[PDB]
Design a protein around this motif. Structure first.
Motif, PDB file in Angstrom:
ATOM      1  N   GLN A   1      34.753  49.671  48.199  1.00 20.25           N
ATOM      2  CA  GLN A   1      34.728  49.126  46.844  1.00 20.25           C
ATOM      3  C   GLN A   1      35.477  47.803  46.758  1.00 20.25           C
ATOM      4  O   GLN A   1      35.010  46.862  46.107  1.00 20.25           O
ATOM      5  CB  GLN A   1      35.325  50.131  45.860  1.00 20.25           C
ATOM      6  N   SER A   2      36.638  47.715  47.402  1.00 19.76           N
ATOM      7  CA  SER A   2      37.483  46.532  47.247  1.00 19.76           C
ATOM      8  C   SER A   2      36.802  45.239  47.682  1.00 19.76           C
ATOM      9  O   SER A   2      36.877  44.251  46.932  1.00 19.76           O
ATOM     10  CB  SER A   2      38.807  46.752  47.986  1.00 19.76           C
ATOM     11  N   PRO A   3      36.134  45.155  48.847  1.00 18.45           N
ATOM     12  CA  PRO A   3      35.526  43.873  49.226  1.00 18.45           C
ATOM     13  C   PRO A   3      34.090  43.700  48.751  1.00 18.45           C
ATOM     14  O   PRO A   3      33.556  42.588  48.803  1.00 18.45           O
ATOM     15  CB  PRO A   3      35.600  43.902  50.756  1.00 18.45           C
ATOM     16  N   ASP A   4      33.447  44.777  48.289  1.00 15.67           N
ATOM     17  CA  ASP A   4      32.013  44.743  48.029  1.00 15.67           C
ATOM     18  C   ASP A   4      31.618  44.922  46.569  1.00 15.67           C
ATOM     19  O   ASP A   4      30.490  44.570  46.213  1.00 15.67           O
ATOM     20  CB  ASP A   4      31.294  45.822  48.854  1.00 15.67           C
ATOM     21  N   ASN A   5      32.496  45.453  45.717  1.00 13.80           N
ATOM     22  CA  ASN A   5      32.072  45.822  44.368  1.00 13.80           C
ATOM     23  C   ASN A   5      32.211  44.671  43.374  1.00 13.80           C
ATOM     24  O   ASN A   5      31.213  44.207  42.816  1.00 13.80           O
ATOM     25  CB  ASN A   5      32.866  47.038  43.880  1.00 13.80           C
ATOM     26  N   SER A   6      33.439  44.193  43.155  1.00 13.10           N
ATOM     27  CA  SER A   6      33.672  43.221  42.090  1.00 13.10           C
ATOM     28  C   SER A   6      33.056  41.866  42.415  1.00 13.10           C
ATOM     29  O   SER A   6      32.520  41.194  41.527  1.00 13.10           O
ATOM     30  CB  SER A   6      35.169  43.079  41.822  1.00 13.10           C
ATOM     31  N   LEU A   7      33.126  41.445  43.678  1.00 14.24           N
ATOM     32  CA  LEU A   7      32.593  40.144  44.064  1.00 14.24           C
ATOM     33  C   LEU A   7      31.070  40.091  44.027  1.00 14.24           C
ATOM     34  O   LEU A   7      30.506  38.997  44.135  1.00 14.24           O
ATOM     35  CB  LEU A   7      33.090  39.775  45.464  1.00 14.24           C
TER      36      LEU A   7
END
Lengths: 34, 48, 49, 52, 53, 32, 50
Positions: G8-14
């Motif tokens: 989630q951290s590298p793939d969700n918000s960005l």
């Protein structure tokens, strides 16, 4: 609040209008919502 | 010498006139599809 | 009450149907092809001729 | 004779006349045509450093 | 439902201003082409002559 | 009318020299 | 649970930042977008926009 009603509420009346051309362009964000 | 001057223009005109009739075939529409697509952008602008 | 307000506000701007053709990307194409090159398309060859 | 040559020379003049004003206007209008959209960068970049 | 009546001050500067003051301003960026010199016509130089140009 | 045409011919011809180099300098640099 | 956050951290918000606002190119197989008009990203990117 109306920004997040685009999850289902505003998603079911006018967000899907451009889906006739957004095969995967908006399919990316509905799969976030679905 | 004079006929040699026309040769670059002569070699051009051999297919230049037919390329209007060659426009409809794929010899041009691989790039020039926009004409057959009638401004392939979006057919000008209506809604997109 | 705000349906006739915000809708026409974009719609009145969007009355510029014709000018979009070079606006096409973000008005950058207009900055790239509406005057950057079309006015330069002639002048590019208006010295070699 | 030169009257007929003037047509070959007015075309040698008129045809090249409406292009210097084009370039001169271009040299006075195209220097800022591209810059007329860069100013929007700040509005598009402020929150880019926020959601990340 | 509460966003219905509360929008009396939403359409003051925020959704009526920012929606309007940036829709045309971006749409009026085009006139910075050859039409840039005629700054008065920029309002009326978009629809009729840009396709002409 | 030849003499009248002659005086206007050179001016109609002198423009070519002043409408090549400046064009060779501007439209080239209207691309940067 | 743990791997989702690792994903989630590298793939969700960005993901959205290019998704809707022209960034994804909206199916860059749509060539005239990022070849005629949205090629403006490619125009100065000498290493990218040949």
């Amino acid at each position: 609040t109306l920004e997040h009603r685009l999850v289902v509420a505003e998603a079911a009346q006018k967000l899907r209008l451009p889906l006739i051309s957004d095969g995967g362009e908006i399919h990316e964000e509905e799969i976030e919502k679905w | 010498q004079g006929a040699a001057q026309n040769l670059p223009a002569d070699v051009n005109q051999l297919i230049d006139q037919l390329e209007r009739h060659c426009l409809a075939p794929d010899g041009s529409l691989v790039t020039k599809s926009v004409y057959s697509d009638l401004q392939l952008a979006r057919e000008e602008m209506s809604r997109e | 009450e705000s349906l006739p307000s915000n809708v026409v506000s974009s719609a009145q701007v969007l009355a510029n149907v014709a000018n979009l053709l070079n606006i096409r990307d973000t008005e950058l194409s207009s900055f790239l092809v509406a005057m950057g090159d079309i006015s330069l398309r002639k002048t590019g060859v208006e010295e070699k001729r | 004779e030169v009257r007929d040559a003037t047509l070959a020379h007015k075309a040698e003049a008129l045809e090249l006349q409406r292009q210097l004003r084009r370039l001169q206007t271009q040299y006075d209008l195209l220097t800022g045509q591209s810059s007329a959209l860069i100013q929007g960068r700040r509005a598009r970049v402020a929150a880019t450093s926020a959601v990340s | 439902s509460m966003d219905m009546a509360d929008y009396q001050m939403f359409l003051a500067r925020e959704i009526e201003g920012r929606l309007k003051e940036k829709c045309d301003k971006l749409a009026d960026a085009i006139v910075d082409d050859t039409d840039s010199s005629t700054g008065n016509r920029n309002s009326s130089a978009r629809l009729p002559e840009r396709v002409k140009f | 009318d030849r003499e009248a045409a002659l005086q206007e011919r050179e001016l109609a011809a002198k423009e070519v020299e002043r409408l090549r180099n400046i064009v060779r300098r501007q439209r080239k640099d209207l691309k940067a | 649970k743990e791997v989702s956050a690792f994903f989630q951290s590298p793939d969700n918000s960005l993901y959205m930042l290019p998704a809707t606002p022209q960034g994804l190119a909206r199916d860059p197989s749509a060539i005239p977008s990022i070849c005629r008009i949205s090629a403006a990203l490619q125009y100065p990117a000498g290493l990218e926009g040949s």
